[PDB]
């Protein structure tokens, strides 16, 4: 029944999707990233800022 | 067999043009797309190494004049 | 920044790890001395084995000492193997490129005014990872500075602000930059 | 995929200053701050790691 | 102050995020690809095109 039936009724046409697999969608892996942080910094205008 | 054995080395000495050596500069790492391999350090695991590193840092600080202060006062000693 | 492969001189025990090199070619002077050491050791040991008098090995070791001592003492300090610009004509053989190592007065070798002091022509401060100068840089920065012992990945005493500037010589070496962006392409179609 | 974070655990004291408009009713400012932790599961045993 | 405060107040709860970095977000990487070009070409119908 349910998902178990979908798992048990294994065929031939599905080997291309699940036989000798490389990935499990349900194993999260993330990369460690270089420490960085962002800041909004004001820059100023050289010359009049107008029309 | 002196003349011969020395020449055998001489013949071989000439021949091995080239120089094999250990990989230079820096070694490199490969990054999984995020499925199918074990991380280098367990995420729970990473914090402990942080903690392990501290052992060394604190031990250095057991001698004030040898490094950096601690959380109070100070301590003296020396070697020999 | 210019990089070269790894080598070493006959001290330690390197004379066995890349074994079976006898005579010099396209090798550094230290490697050439190592190859001569290999020649002498194998020759003398083989001669001692052929004629079991146990003294040809002694003479081989003695001449090893002679060659190594000559190389150690007779080296000429007049080397200016500094690579920059378009030409490096001093030598084409394998050699260690000159580096301006970090110093107490200039922890990061930023060539602020040290260039005008004594060097005049100052070799570039080579890569952060070349010769373990990262440890020396950290040691020089942490000279006379106290840490609060709440940061074992020390960023609290402002490591990040300090760094090596992109150029560490008197001149930006614009020729190398231009060759980087615009290759010579050797003999082109118009020629 | 983590793309940066602020480690508030080392911010001994944090304050957020709001300059308010002149026409607001008295009420609440509800402040949310999604953060990171590690789900720590071993030998049948769970729990969330700090 | 600024990003410096975020970077410098480095703790323990971030080791697993930035220690021994694996990825630098600031290094764009793209892969070189097979040379190709696309063209729209009209095809014709064999037989009447009608209701």
Swiss-Prot record, chain C:
GO cellular component: membrane; viral capsid; virion membrane
Disulfide bonds: 99-126
PTM notes: Stabilized by 2 intramolecular disulfide bonds.
Subcellular location(s) per record: Virion membrane
Induction description: Expressed in the late phase of the viral replicative cycle.
Transmembrane segments: 29-50, 55-75
Any Pfam family: P9_TM
Keywords on record: Capsid protein, Disulfide bond, Late protein, Membrane, Transmembrane, Virion
Lineage top rank: taxon: Viruses
Record note on domains: The transmembrane regions anchor the protein in the membrane of the underlying inner membrane.
Free-text function comment from the UniProt entry: One of the minor capsid proteins that constitute a network internal to the major capsid proteins and outside the lipid membrane. The minor capsid proteins glue and stabilize the capsomers.
Quaternary state and interactors: Interacts with the major capsid protein.
Name under which the protein is recorded: Minor capsid protein P9
Primary gene name: A407L
